[PDB]
Amino acid sequence: VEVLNIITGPDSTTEIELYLEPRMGINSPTGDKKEWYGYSEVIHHADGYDNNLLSIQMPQYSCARVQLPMLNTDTLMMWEAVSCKTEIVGIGSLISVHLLEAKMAAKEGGDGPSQPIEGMNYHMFAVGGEPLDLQGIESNALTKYASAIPPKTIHPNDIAKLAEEEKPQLQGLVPKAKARLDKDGFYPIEEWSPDPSRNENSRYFGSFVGGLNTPPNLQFTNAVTTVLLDENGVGPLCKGDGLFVSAADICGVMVKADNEAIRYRGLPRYFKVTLRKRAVKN
Amino acid sequence: VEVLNIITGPDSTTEIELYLEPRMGINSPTGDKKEWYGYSEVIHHADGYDNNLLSIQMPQYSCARVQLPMLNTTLMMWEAVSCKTEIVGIGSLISVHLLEAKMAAKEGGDGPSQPIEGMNYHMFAVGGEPLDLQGIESNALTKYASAIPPKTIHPNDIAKLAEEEKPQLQGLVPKAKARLDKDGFYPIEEWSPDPSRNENSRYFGSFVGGLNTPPNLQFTNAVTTVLLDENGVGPLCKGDGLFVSAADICGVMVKADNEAIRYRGLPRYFKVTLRKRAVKN
Amino acid sequence: EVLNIITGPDSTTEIELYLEPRMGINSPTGDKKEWYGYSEVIHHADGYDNNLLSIQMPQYSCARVQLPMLNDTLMMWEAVSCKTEIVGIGSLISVHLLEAKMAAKEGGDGPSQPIEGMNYHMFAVGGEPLDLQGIESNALTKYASAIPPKTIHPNDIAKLAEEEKPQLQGLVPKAKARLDKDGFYPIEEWSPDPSRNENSRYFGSFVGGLNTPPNLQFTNAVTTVLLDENGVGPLCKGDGLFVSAADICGVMVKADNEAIRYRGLPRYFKVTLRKRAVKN
Amino acid sequence: VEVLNIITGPDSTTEIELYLEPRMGINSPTGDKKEWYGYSEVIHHADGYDNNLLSIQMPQYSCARVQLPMLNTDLMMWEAVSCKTEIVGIGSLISVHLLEAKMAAKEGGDGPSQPIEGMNYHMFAVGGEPLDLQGIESNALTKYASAIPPKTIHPNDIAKLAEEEKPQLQGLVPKAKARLDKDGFYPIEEWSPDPSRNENSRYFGSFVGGLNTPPNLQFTNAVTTVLLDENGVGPLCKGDGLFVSAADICGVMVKADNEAIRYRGLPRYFKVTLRKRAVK
Amino acid sequence: VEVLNIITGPDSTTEIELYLEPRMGINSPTGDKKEWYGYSEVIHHADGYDNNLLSIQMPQYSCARVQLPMLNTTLMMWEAVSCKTEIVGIGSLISVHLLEAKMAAKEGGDGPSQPIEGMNYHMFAVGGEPLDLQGIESNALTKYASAIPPKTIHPNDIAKLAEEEKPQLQGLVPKAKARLDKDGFYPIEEWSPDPSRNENSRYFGSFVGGLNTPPNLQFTNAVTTVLLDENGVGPLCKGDGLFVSAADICGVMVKADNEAIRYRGLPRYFKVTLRKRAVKN
Ligand SMILES: [Mg+2]
Ligand SMILES: [Mg+2]
Ligand SMILES: [Mg+2]
Ligand SMILES: [Mg+2]
Ligand SMILES: [Mg+2]
Ligand SMILES: [Mg+2]
Ligand SMILES: [Mg+2]
Ligand SMILES: [Mg+2]
Ligand SMILES: [Mg+2]
Ligand SMILES: [Mg+2]
């Protein structure tokens, strides 16, 4: 669409708010594993080699489409996302040093606190007028993944369909390994990144701090607004009067006392997005 | 309501100042545990599983309401424009002779104590009404002690989820909402500022986790925090009250005899500048 | 001589590409294809007890992109700005890395050590190949030779006698090259040359050590401006744009002997160009 | 005071420069302990419990009053506008041959010493009256030695709480207030700048704690600190006195024989620029 | 000199570029120790106590005077306005096969070497005359070796304090002053830029200490450092000389056999832009 003038006058703006709950692999507070909702299943070093890596061991992106007030119901209009407030909620919970099943931080014979949540932090949020474009990669192209119908997750080679001999290409950049973030708890973080070659109609912001013992470093405020306008002053334009929000917030890992295996911990993300009416020509 | 013009002229502005003392769990310098005022009770890895987690083992938010000069006695409200805030007693964190603290030296050494280090949780807020809180749990089935009168409130006190439903609290339970309306009552480990409310508050928060992290803190009187939003409107004080809230966990001390920890908190100063703002009811 | 910016329709263009990492195993083909995007294993005495191999030496990526052919006024493409991203940062959360050391005590079943340690990140956009300056940490390191050569070393150009090679631990002005070949110039021997690169813009950071947490951001909301203090960006000779990159994201540690491999990630570039009038 | 116009003309500005030497506890290069000037006395975990903690084990604030050119000879005050401040001798922190310092190597080794590292407390202040101080105790019942005359003042020297009320000092005791009116006298561990006062002072402070943390310090003559408030008004010098205050704990050394520590401080330079301000 | 107008005209500016090679102590790629050019000699904890500390064990400041085009053949001086500067060879710091370096693995492993890490000291200066230095000692009674002719100069070489007064040098001795007037002669561990002088120089310094700290270094040709003071005046080049100074310790290597260290330095590049300035004498 050709983008024309910002529409002025009353009822020219609106605001939408929502939460994305974390999809760390145990994605429902129902069923056998409900006690660990908001965490991954336990991961051991030879998972994906000695056995098939399960979807419940692979933190995934969160996403939602929000229905906007129907436009075009004079001038053809679309909702334009201009700015958002986003917040990781429950950061205070990460002070706990009495984590159930967690390794004790003390010498043998001590009675110390648990190790708290620490280690790799992966934080991303996106706002767009259509689903977020993803690019696939593998750290280990020959990782063994559990297979189900219906699929619980999608892997880059499910799309790229390289033969065993060509799958090492996935440790680099395989142009065919592309997808849209159209399903919540379905695309693993460890295999999918936002695609900087697309996303012309989305904005995304991410940080990663790696390692297993690194201090989680997180801020929270309602005083900071993220501007979603591009260099021409145009924000994401909401196709079908739909706003698409995407998130991933791995806040670290817990370490299990009995075998020192880990689980990822995620927190919910809040979004408040401000939108204005923009005139367009088809 | 509808905000109109900033009121100008003589006595159109005012300033308030106060201290919030830390509520790390031992919240009074009186009684059995008064020696540990400004610290938590000792915490061990199985507390809340093998026993009931005590209110005194849970660092809590500080809060106060400050009465302003009464207005309307043009409708007018006090509008908080800016504040100076400061953590006081940072230099006390240099101590390497902490009472009962683990020695930082090999066996047979005479080294210093481990100083205060590890997880830092710093938050201040200024608002025209109590700060909105959202409940969470790191572990939904943590066992909590029940004191008389009750010393803390927990998210499930409000959500009233059945034991099979409580794992919802590891995510976002919308019913688990409260207002920061009592000093030393809302635990930091279960309550966060609610970003879905707080339209009339400003909050600023930082967390650095782990047990060994260096506390990293600045102090100055040369920095002003602006409380105005994108429209140039600050918090509007309902009932001619200003609400201030804080949490400042500065780290942990480690006990020599069993390597259990206590949180350490420091007091926070606030100076808030306000101006009269015309409003339409 | 640089004249006015060209105005009007079709006065600008955009080009997009990916540079794949060249950490030493530079092809997903042959005996070592399973470690594409990683280096060969490195041990402390490699380059002393044996010849250091090209596959053990992370290298710069580069490509030349053909622009729309230009040519009233003579015209060059001028690189104004770019968006660049490291892609696949999410893959660095893996704690089940094949052959990696276990992060737990003997008798544990803990996760693998994740990728961590030294990060070397550089990107460059230029109207001609990036100028490089040669150095050696250890001037007498032994390097393997092949024909065709898999890498070029500063002394291949400087041609110092063995007694003079210690000069390469400082600054040897003759040890200069141009980044004209992808997966050829080792990071550990070649730096962007600050005495040239008049027609190139480069940006780099290094955080060293073997245990350091990788610290990486990714966004599409940040533009890097390529204009100099006079408002002139890279001017594209032969209607070619030259992009260069190095992204060492850290190392993996082998369970067997605690030897390491470097890990690199691909880098995306989008470069916005405008027509600049020039004279001669 | 009601503040009026800046006074312009010749002789309307002046510049003050001086050094504050560190007061880490060994506050003089004379006497039995002179070898450790610029360090604290050694500190053990049980000091203040098993024995009385000494003034020489407690880093203290540095301060000076500087007399300015007298005004209202026969209403004007000096206004501090800006300052350049520098920690001098930062290069000395590279030493890995510190006297009596723990060796950084395994038993059997001949490694370097541990260098200065761990908790860094850096503060400077410029004001037109003494810096206001608020008292606190990390441990309210710490036992302090009493010298004659007194070498330090403690918060309860002013608050005078009974031993049963002293745990109040682990929070905020409003009675525990003092002015930084004496060099090498106010312990950093018990006194902080009082943010409820200091309306006529500007202070700047950074702390990074722990025993293992790297010192992180900058030095330049290219940065000016502005002392003006939101109204463009700097500190106004009461009685034509400028007050400068500092604390620069750069880290600790570890003793080889018992692993006890001494704090190490460095001297701080100030250049303050002042102008005449009319006042009612 | 009273400073007047910037001189405009076609031949009113010039640009100089040069390298300063590192003086970590082994200061020439010739002689017995040429193999360790760009490093210090090995350093042990008791050096300067059980023995005389050698000049080759003490990182030193680099410096050069560049001859500018002669002016005054009305009265004029070269004014340094801005520079680009760069640490060259940062990529070399990825090496984990350092000759003679400690293995980063358990006994019986075959791990990589420990790479260059630990203390980073980075300083550059541009002046119209030699940089002013202030002397200090971490340990006033360190024993310095005394070569003929001297290979370094020590603060007490200028302050001439008796042994009983030398502890003054752990603070600030006003007499301990020098000018950075010789390449590889002034140890970093004893000499800092003098902030009480250097009215006609600009210096920029950073230090990160410890033995295990990751080097943290950037490189670009997109960053220009402005040398103009508050008044818009850059350094004025006395006798038509430009004075550049540097120190770039990038970390230490750790020896396998006894875990003694060597410092490692890298070369620094300078491009300085100068303009003609009128002055009055
Ligand atoms: Mg490919
Ligand atoms: Mg595109
Ligand atoms: Mg829910
Ligand atoms: Mg809301
Ligand atoms: Mg040379
Ligand atoms: Mg040049
Ligand atoms: Mg009190
Ligand atoms: Mg006050
Ligand atoms: Mg002196
Ligand atoms: Mg001076």
Side-chain angles (χ1 to χ4, degrees), chain B residues 251-264:
Chain B
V252 302
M253 71 158 285
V254 181
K255 280 230 303 167
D257 51 351
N258 61 11
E259 293 177 87
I261 62 88
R262 296 180 182 269
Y263 294 103
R264 177 54 166 150

Side-chain angles (χ1 to χ4, degrees), chain C residues 44-45 138, chain E residues 36 95-101 103-104 111-116 253-254 256-257 260:
Chain C
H44 72 274
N138 298 138
Chain E
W36 295 102
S95 185
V96 302
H97 54 77
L98 285 169
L99 267 167
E100 298 183 12
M103 181 175 69
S113 78
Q114 291 180 26
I116 298 304
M253 63 159 295
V254 181
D257 52 2

Side-chain angles (χ1 to χ4, degrees), chain B residues 19 43 55 122:
Chain B
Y19 272 110
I43 298 159
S55 291
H122 298 285

Side-chain angles (χ1 to χ4, degrees), chain B residues 92-105 108-150 152-159 161-162 165-172:
Chain B
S92 70
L93 301 183
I94 73 162
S95 177
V96 290
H97 53 75
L98 284 175
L99 187 136
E100 295 182 7
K102 182 166 180 72
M103 179 177 61
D110 199 357
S113 83
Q114 286 179 30
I116 299 295
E117 64 184 15
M119 59 204 84
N120 264 253
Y121 184 92
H122 298 285
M123 191 227 44
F124 71 94
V126 178
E129 64 199 76
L131 188 79
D132 300 299
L133 302 170
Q134 171 69 52
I136 198 164
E137 293 289 335
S138 44
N139 299 132
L141 298 193
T142 303
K143 300 176 182 84
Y144 295 108
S146 295
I148 325 282
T152 53
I153 192 159
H154 312 293
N156 207 44
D157 290 342
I158 296 137
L161 298 169
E165 303 183 292
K166 279 173 71 174
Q168 288 177 31
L169 292 164
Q170 289 175 192
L172 201 290

Side-chain angles (χ1 to χ4, degrees), chain A residues 139-140, chain C residues 35 38-39 41-42 97-101 112-117 210 249-255 258-263, chain E residues 112:
Chain A
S139 46
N140 301 136
Chain C
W35 297 105
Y38 297 76
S39 77
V41 177
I42 299 153
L97 285 175
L98 283 181
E99 291 179 21
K101 176 185 183 60
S112 88
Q113 286 227 273
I115 298 305
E116 59 187 8
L210 274 172
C249 295
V251 307
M252 67 162 273
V253 181
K254 280 201 64 227
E258 305 184 72
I260 72 84
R261 299 177 181 274
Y262 294 106
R263 175 55 168 152

Side-chain angles (χ1 to χ4, degrees), chain E residues 50-69 71-73 75-76:
Chain E
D50 285 353
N51 62 48
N52 295 334
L53 191 69
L54 297 175
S55 290
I56 55 165
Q57 295 178 293
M58 299 175 82
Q60 295 138 30
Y61 287 101
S62 298
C63 67
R65 175 188 183 286
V66 182
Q67 181 62 54
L68 301 166
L71 310 173
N72 313 286
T73 66
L75 205 65
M76 298 184 296

Side-chain angles (χ1 to χ4, degrees), chain C residues 168-173 175-180 182-228 230-247:
Chain C
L168 286 165
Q169 291 182 183
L171 200 294
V172 175
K176 291 192 205 314
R178 283 214 138 186
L179 180 46
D180 52 15
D182 180 72
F184 195 61
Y185 288 94
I187 292 165
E188 67 196 84
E189 289 178 292
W190 298 102
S191 292
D193 180 4
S195 70
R196 304 180 181 188
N197 289 309
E198 293 88 4
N199 193 37
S200 285
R201 307 300 185 265
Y202 68 85
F203 315 84
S205 62
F206 175 63
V207 185
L210 274 172
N211 298 120
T212 321
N215 184 352
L216 300 181
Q217 298 169 22
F218 51 105
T219 182
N220 64 346
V222 161
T223 294
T224 306
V225 175
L226 300 175
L227 304 182
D228 70 15
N230 298 328
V232 187
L235 291 173
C236 289
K237 297 171 162 187
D239 288 329
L241 184 73
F242 297 74
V243 301
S244 306
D247 294 284

